[PDB]
Design a protein around this ligand. Structure first.
Ligand SMILES: CC(C)(COP(=O)(O)OP(=O)(O)OC[C@H]1O[C@@H](n2cnc3c(N)ncnc32)[C@@H](O)[C@@H]1OP(=O)(O)O)[C@@H](O)C(=O)NCCC(=O)NCCS
Ligand SMILES: CC(C)(COP(=O)(O)OP(=O)(O)OC[C@H]1O[C@@H](n2cnc3c(N)ncnc32)[C@@H](O)[C@@H]1OP(=O)(O)O)[C@@H](O)C(=O)NCCC(=O)NCCS
Lengths: 388, 388
């Protein structure tokens, strides 16, 4: 037997392509304007007057209008442990998210599969990504069962990844699709803040920042190489990827999964680190392609908070409009961790089509997607848009 | 710009190849013959006379002679919580394994890199796999730092995977190496039983079975396509992979990460499920290659326990020698979860070379590697040996 012949026949020929995008969120919509009042009340912390004032400034500057949350007043009233800053509560939190992560991911996946339009029996690979909870068999098994995928779908269960992992799943799906003829990858990012929610403490102000920014959501993609002309419909193509660890960033974003749930720390200036290192990321990605005008490409940036976006825009002299799609997702959903960047791709291609632009990438040809998270890690994905 | 030209120039040409293997284990070597005495004593359970008798029969039938364990008598005496069947103890367990998983994985990785012989700056991708503990940034970040890999190594952090994931990491490394020209993937599986160790309970006999079988260890590989002739040295080639979920197996192997650590359940007949489904796995893998004599291929099977191996051997009428390398690893190290299958590949190629056989696969051309674990999941990797 010829392994050379097997290899040539086994592999795909064209670039990995996003062929569908679907999203979902918990039904509970929580307004940001009044969240400090809600949160200081539900956590029994109304006596902490200056801390609450601080939180209201964090929420007012967050540029978030609303977030969708699995957690409700009723669930929180049944779980005082979760409402404390640091109380034993992982078992209760796990019980929530081992069910809600695949439930929410299913909703997003059904929408992506409907848009794709092909039989779900043609899904060959499944990537599931979450930072909320872990279990064995994982959320990947659960979504296989919930969706009725083939039992021999090839699964990639990405746990405890953090906010950069919307880029990670794309980087992974690219190789799965491109190296395997006919492969169709279902990608699901599903993030639920019930493992990180906790009450406020005035010696842990970084923890408080997470309470102002993180919200819930799932996004699903279909990714494949060699799309079938006029049966499947390309939305974006992936061309190149990178992942790197920024220098001088040790401990900038840390999270520990403990008996009290998932903790969150920020020990460094994350917006400054991102903005000091983003140019190197762009020249690695775009100098080989001959492009150096970063306003000439379309942008997707993980909105870890608005300060990251503001400082990158300032560093690079981006026109304010470059970040429009990103900021619209931050505004209507908050920081959904790994899923966020995928919601921004959906926003971008939907507005570009609805408004009669020439490409799904705001009428531009090349684009970039960035994930930012623990490490400090930067994920880069170079994208090409599709005409109309 | 031509994306077709970029894609063609970006990709590798030959099959993903294992180019180095290194292993490591905790220094504490625990004899199996006397483990029931040690374990019932350290867990304060000497009054449970019939349960202890049961455990000694489990250990005597386990076909394990010894295991390496991070946990020592002294560590256990400082952590009575861990010695209880079910007490709050995840924070202590995490603190152990967030450090020991990357420490142990580093030792294995340094040996693999030494054998490979190339600059570690040529490692482009890093896969880290563990079922013990989680953290943010993960064990992948920690090993990047501990080894001094390039900060732009592309990382794949595989958490809470379970016993099939030695096959999963190979399935993943295959696509990374084959789709990326020049890519060299460092693969590290590192498993430490401090998250699952717990005392005995007579209404949780499945939990007790894990206490008899699981041991600690790490294995590291270098995987790449297009090896540089006579600079790099191929050991095994990967040709095809699959993953499937066995029918009628819901709940057969479950593990929940809780405030009391990682629990372990067996609610179905795992050896019977594996042996009823292994033939279908083999015909999917080997009928396309024209082979149907399963004694004519070399074998690597995850030794989840000896009964799996015995019942597969019986089902297929394997000659007793087929499972020799697998059983030798079970005997000297026990069930090291994801790392086990990689220790068996090392055992197999070392004995094949030491004993002057014609190929690294016991003198045979084609081989199969199986991972078994939660789902019930079966991972299949079709291998080709290398001459001498
Ligand atoms: C939080 C945020 C929206 C506030 O907007 P802002 O323009 O920076 O506003 P201000 O300077 O007026 O301060 C807002 C509150 O942020 C706080 N804050 C932000 N990051 C914090 C951290 N690293 N530690 C402590 N406090 C933090 C306070 O420090 C400050 O309250 P105060 O100055 O009135 O006491 C903005 O800091 C942000 O987007 N930070 C995100 C950084 C990031 O790490 N995101 C990664 C998530 S993984
Ligand atoms: C555990 C093992 C080594 C014992 O060898 P054995 O040949 O089966 O021996 P025996 O039939 O004499 O019994 C051994 C002890 O295993 C126990 N045992 C094994 N699996 C158990 C489970 N599913 N639930 C309850 N008890 C279990 C007892 O039931 C039995 O003690 P007893 O019969 O004297 O009360 C063998 O059962 C094994 O390899 N099982 C592995 C199955 C597996 O699930 N591994 C997956 C790990 S993820």
């Amino acid at each position: 037997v010829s392994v050379s012949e097997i290899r040539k026949a086994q592999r795909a020929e064209g670039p990995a392509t996003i062929l569908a995008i679907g999203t979902a969120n918990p039904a509970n919509c929580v307004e940001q304007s009044t969240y400090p009042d809600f949160y200081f009340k539900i956590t029994n912390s109304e006596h902490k007057t200056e801390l609450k004032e601080k939180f209201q400034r964090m929420c007012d500057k967050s540029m978030i209008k609303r977030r969708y949350m699995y957690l409700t007043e009723e669930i929180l009233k049944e779980n005082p442990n979760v409402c404390e800053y640091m109380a034993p509560s992982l078992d209760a939190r796990q019980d929530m998210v081992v069910v809600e992560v695949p439930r929410l991911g299913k909703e997003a996946a059904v929408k992506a599969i409907k848009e794709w339009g092909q039989p779900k029996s043609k899904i060959t690979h499944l990537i599931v990504c979450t930072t909320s909870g872990v279990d064995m068999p994982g959320a990947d098994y659960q979504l296989t069962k919930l969706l009725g995928l083939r039992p021999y779908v090839k699964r990639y269960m990405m746990y405890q990844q953090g906010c950069f992992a919307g880029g990670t799943v794309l980087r992974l799906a690219k190789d799965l699709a491109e190296n395997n003829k006919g492969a169709r990858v279902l990608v699901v990012c599903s993030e639920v803040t019930a493992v990180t929610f906790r009450g406020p403490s005035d010696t842990h102000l970084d923890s408080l920042v997470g309470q102002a920014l993180f919200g819930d959501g799932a996004a699903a993609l279909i990714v494949g190489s060699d799309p079938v002309p006029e049966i499947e419909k390309p939305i974006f193509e992936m061309v190149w990827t990178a992942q790197t660890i920024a220098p001088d960033s040790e401990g900038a974003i840390d999270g520990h999964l403990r008996e009290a749930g998932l903790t969150f720390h920020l020990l460094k200036d994350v917006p400054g680190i991102v903005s000091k290192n983003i140019t190197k990321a762009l020249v690695e990605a775009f100098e080989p392609l001959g492009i150096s005008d970063y306003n000439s490409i379309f942008w997707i940036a993980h909105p870890g908070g608005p300060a990251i976006l503001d400082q990158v825009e300032q560093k690079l002299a981006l026109k304010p409009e470059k970040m429009n799609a990103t900021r619209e997702v931050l505004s209507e959903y908050g920081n959904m961790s790994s899923a966020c960047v995928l919601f921004i791709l959906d926003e971008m291609r939907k507005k570009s089509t609805q408004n009669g632009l020439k490409t799904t990438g705001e009428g531009l040809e090349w684009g970039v997607l960035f994930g930012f998270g623990p490490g400090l890690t930067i994920e880069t994905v170079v994208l090409r848009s599709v005409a109309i």
